[PDB]
Amino acid sequence: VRPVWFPGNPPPAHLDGSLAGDYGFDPLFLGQEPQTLKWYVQAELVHGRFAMLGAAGIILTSIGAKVGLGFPEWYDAGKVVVEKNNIDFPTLMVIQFYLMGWAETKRWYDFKNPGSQADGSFLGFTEEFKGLENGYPGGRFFDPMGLSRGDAAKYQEYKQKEVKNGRLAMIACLGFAAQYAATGKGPLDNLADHLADPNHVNFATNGVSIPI
Amino acid sequence: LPGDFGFDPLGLLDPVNSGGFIEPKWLQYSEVIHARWAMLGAAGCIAPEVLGAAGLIPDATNIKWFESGVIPPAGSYNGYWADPYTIFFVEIVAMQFAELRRLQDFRYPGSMGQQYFLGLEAIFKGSGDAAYPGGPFFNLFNLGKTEAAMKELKLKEIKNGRLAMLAMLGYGAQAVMTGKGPFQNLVEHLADPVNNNILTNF
Amino acid sequence: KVKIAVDRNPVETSFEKWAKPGHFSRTLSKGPNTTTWIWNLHADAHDFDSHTSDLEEISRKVFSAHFGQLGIIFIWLSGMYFHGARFSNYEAWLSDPTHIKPSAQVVWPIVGQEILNGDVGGGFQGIQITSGFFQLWRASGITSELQLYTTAIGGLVMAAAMFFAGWFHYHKAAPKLEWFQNVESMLNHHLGGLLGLGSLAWAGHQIHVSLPVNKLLDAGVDPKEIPLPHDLLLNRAIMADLYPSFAKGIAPFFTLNWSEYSDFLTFKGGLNPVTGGLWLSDTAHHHVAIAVLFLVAGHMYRTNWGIGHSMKEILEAHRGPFTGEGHVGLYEILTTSWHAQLAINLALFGSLSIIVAHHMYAMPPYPYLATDYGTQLSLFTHHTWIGGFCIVGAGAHAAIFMVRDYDPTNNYNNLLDRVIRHRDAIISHLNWVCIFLGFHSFGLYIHNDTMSALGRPQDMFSDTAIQLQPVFAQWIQNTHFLAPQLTAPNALAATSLTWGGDLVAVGGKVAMMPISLGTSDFMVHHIHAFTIHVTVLILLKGVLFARSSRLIPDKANLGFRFPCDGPGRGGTCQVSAWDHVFLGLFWMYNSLSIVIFHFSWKMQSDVWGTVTGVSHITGGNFAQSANTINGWLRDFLWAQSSQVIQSYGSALSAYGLIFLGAHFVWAFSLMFLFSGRGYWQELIESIVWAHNKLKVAPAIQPRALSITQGRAVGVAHYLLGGIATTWSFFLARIISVG
Amino acid sequence: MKDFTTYLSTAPVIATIWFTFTAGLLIEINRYFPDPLVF
């Protein structure tokens, strides 16, 4: 009864509508298995949040570029900033590695053992590394504002909005990648261009995307 | 049933062991589908030429139909507000939606009037028959509230559509042979039913 | 009443049985305990008669099987076109088919396989393809590798379609037995439509595409200079330029004035001398004739209306006095046994492919093909081998039928019955004649070599010594040489120069010349004849006594394939028609190896070479060396061996490599050929003691192969080694010397 | 899906994939490190 990703057909078995963003879309039944499905839930959450990060930073930097603030174009920005500063690329990379490794490992072994990460074996903290749900580590740290601990209904709505904006951000960053891969320019530039002539600024005008 | 003059030599209407899309329902469905298409195609190809013949339309218009640009080798028109492919793109997505939901009916009747579709779902109950939905839209006016006149309209539709299909065949064949407008050919064969014929064009 | 009969959604679609080995068969479905389980599992995967008993379901199985087969072939052709479009010098060779070697395979810059990317002309670095795709595409008139790109793409699409077709027709809608049995319908359909239409469409493509573009090719215009094919289709102007008949279009055809169209339907015969290919006008005339023929042919039998014919009726009608029931019931038989139609088609098709190769080297159609001596030889040997194997497979499945589907109760006194009766006298006469043939034909060469070593060449059998001149073949050759005068007044040239006449030269290479026939050729023909007669002998014995024998009155009860019936009463070793077709494989390989030797040497000696006189490759040595086997071995083998035995350091070095490797594997087969599975299992028991000694036994009980399986492994490896050795030798020699 | 997983856990396909993995390993090895003789 809930709006299917494809109106008219019935949803699959392992897809029901229990999690936000469920429109019955697994034409390949990858989630036939509960463990794998739940894992995929967490993976989609993580990737969507990352894409949200990506889109936000990109759009900010691109505004700073187009308006005369001297902000580099994102795909150049990493090189240009490492050059403008006296930083060592491998050092940056390895410290970043350390950090992401530790935190992501904590998350990994929490997925393994649901609650062993809040035992207080860490320095002095307890339940502040206790996941509220799979992919939902709602605690005092991952929810100091405590949105999860009030109005579970509006909270579910927020989950809906979260996964929504997350899939949107994923497709958005892919889009940006494509815009640069095509035009060699800034996505905001190409935007203003399509603004100039929607009739004549598009992939069909690029002739590259559609090769005719 | 309408348009059945017993004209099935090879006996394709055989019900036993049917299946796939060899099945009377889908068969006549496609029949009337293509028939309506051909009606529209006749109107489309014929309009602009006679329209310019009346001069009520500009001469930038009224180029021969095939010279539109659908086959650029056959010639294209320019003055179109956008690109050929530009138009073609949105055209694709639109017809995708239309045909898809029509098929969703044909496979699951009435099953396009339940998921929220902007209030246009009572419109999408149609009936228990493809090619004949009706509904408030697909039957604006209750034309044929009696079944006699209903089947009358049905037969008229069938005859008109099959004939229009034949007309499209003729249009294509002549425009290939003489490379001129069908209206051109009409004017010609009227100038000479004797000297303006397919025999002349050899 | 012929119509369409199908069953909807018969088979489902799940990967369930995919996880279930042996599910198709009863016993294998029980799973493996010993190792032969896997072997037999594989062996019986496509024995649908073993699978079940439903004729209809088996028909559907084989139907989908054919679907998938076609899909495989589509894949292969498409990949060929793809690599032709992407990794070839075909356009260079188009600019110059006279000094660029067709090459389409490039390798990677690795440990040393890179040396093989030799120089074939046009700055290209790859491997000379002997397939002849270049001349093929030029005859078809392909110009831009873009065309091959499109071609490969469409092939991918076609393959995908065919595989979906198999899937749908097996799991979604599978036809019904009567539908499969509407035989006269199928015949009319195929006979008319498939062949006639294909030929006619090819002729149309020829006329409107290739003949114009190939005409301009031989005119000498740059390849990238000719207008496009569809542009040609548009502009009848240029078509009338090439041939003014086109100015009148088609009304002359509608007025039966075919004479005018002669500009493109000629009857020249012979080759285009500037090209060495057949006259494309003549080719199109050929194909359109074939087309009309098959078209009018496809309307012979009744399907749903009073007119037509009844195969059954006519076959029953045809009966003679000495023959009893004549041709009765065979209708019933063919309507029922898959293996019958199979074996029939296989024998016919093998014979065809042989004839194909024959006529192909006889009158090469492709541009500058005759020059590519290597391609000629290669395709010829290829198709010959394919045909012979088709023959033996025919014999195989015929014997298979005779074991399985046979029934006396329906065939009372038919051709089959009297055959079964007097089979002994038949086979006896066959033995005698084969023995005589072998004796005479072999002893000829042997007595020659004997007088030679004895220094009495006066007493040999040579075209100089005591002669055996094929007066028949030479008389017929001259007959064909003189035929066009009266028996073919509208003829310009004989179909072949070997009927007699002049020599055609394209680029110095000998394209074609008339070939004479000496006592040497007499002898080699008789050799071939004897060998083939031996092969038919062994096959016929296998099939005739497959069900029984005065030794085994109940042989039909032991299945088709079976090791033996013990060592009792002397020893039953190797008593299956399976074994018989095995032996036949052997004798066939022998036969065709001999034939290709004959072909290669005679070509090199009296045909090929370079014009100036004729610089014959071996200078016709064959003429006097072939009468003696010493001359054979030395002057042919030992001589032409140099190319392969010194090919190292060259891009062709792989030829000698694979030469030695084929030697290796061919000898490897012999351990199977000679050993004993009992001995083997004894060794198995020893080694499993060794293993269990360390608690390392495998669950699946290791087992020595069946007698049959060992036989098969050995023979496969043997034939592989032999054919590969010969293949390498030929390739290296011809690439070096041609 | 589970049927598919089982089909992949079947034996010859596993032998296949392991061999492919090893072979690609060694080919890339020789690619980036050509001509090994000692050490």
Ligand SMILES: CC1=C(C/C=C(\C)CCC[C@H](C)CCC[C@H](C)CCCC(C)C)C(=O)c2ccccc2C1=O
């Ligand atoms: C050598 C030999 C054997 C012994 C050899 C046998 C049985 C073949 C062994 C095949 C392989 C090597 C065994 C199967 C290996 C498994 C797949 C285990 C995994 C191995 C990995 C490398 C994949 C016979 O049994 C035999 C029987 C009849 C006539 C001739 C012969 C014969 O010549």
Ligand code: SF4
């Ligand atoms: S196993 Fe071999 S040797 Fe023993 S009886 Fe059978 S065929 Fe003869």
